[PDB]
Write a protein that binds this DNA or RNA. Structure first.
Ligand SMILES: [Mg+2]
Ligand SMILES: [Mg+2]
Length: 134
RNA sequence: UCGACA
DNA sequence: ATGTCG
């Protein structure tokens, strides 16, 4: 039913899938951009959606913030709950970068605790997530 | 069937 | 329109 305005919204942006991946986190209320990751030459949508949520967890934890995080990605929300990113992306020299980030994010989740609620953004009811690249 | 990314 | 990540 209602939107928690006091929250962080994250989203992935890509050119191709697999292709160039970036992601960002914004204040759900204002759209202020709080963080934006530099483009990764090759990655998948779901790897970027996963990295964006874990980045968000780290970002809120470091700031002593209890805000929830919104993502529109059912996949990535589950990966974070599992502490495991089940991506099909081949491992090679070109995908080394994003696979290192993904392994590091998983290791962060295995070494830290959080109470942050990770919430599904209801695109069908509320329109595009406010972190959308549009 | 559904959630995304193009 | 057609394609890929889940
Ligand atoms: Mg998304
Ligand atoms: Mg989007």
């Amino acid at each position: 039913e209602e939107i928690i305005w006091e929250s962080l919204s994250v989203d992935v942006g890509s050119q191709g899938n697999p292709g160039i991946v970036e992601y960002k986190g914004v204040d759900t209320k204002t759209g202020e951009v709080l963080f934006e990751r530099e483009p990764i030459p090759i990655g998948t949508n779901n790897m970027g959606e996963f990295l964006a949520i874990v980045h968000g967890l780290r970002y809120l934890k470091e700031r002593n913030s209890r805000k929830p995080i919104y993502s529109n990605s059912q996949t990535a929300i589950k990966w974070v709950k599992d502490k495991k990113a089940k991506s099909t992306l081949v491992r090679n020299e070109e995908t080394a970068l994003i696979w290192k980030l993904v392994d590091e994010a998983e290791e962060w989740l295995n070494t830290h605790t959080y109470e942050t609620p990770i919430l599904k953004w209801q695109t069908d009811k509320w329109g595009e997530i406010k972190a959308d690249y549009g």
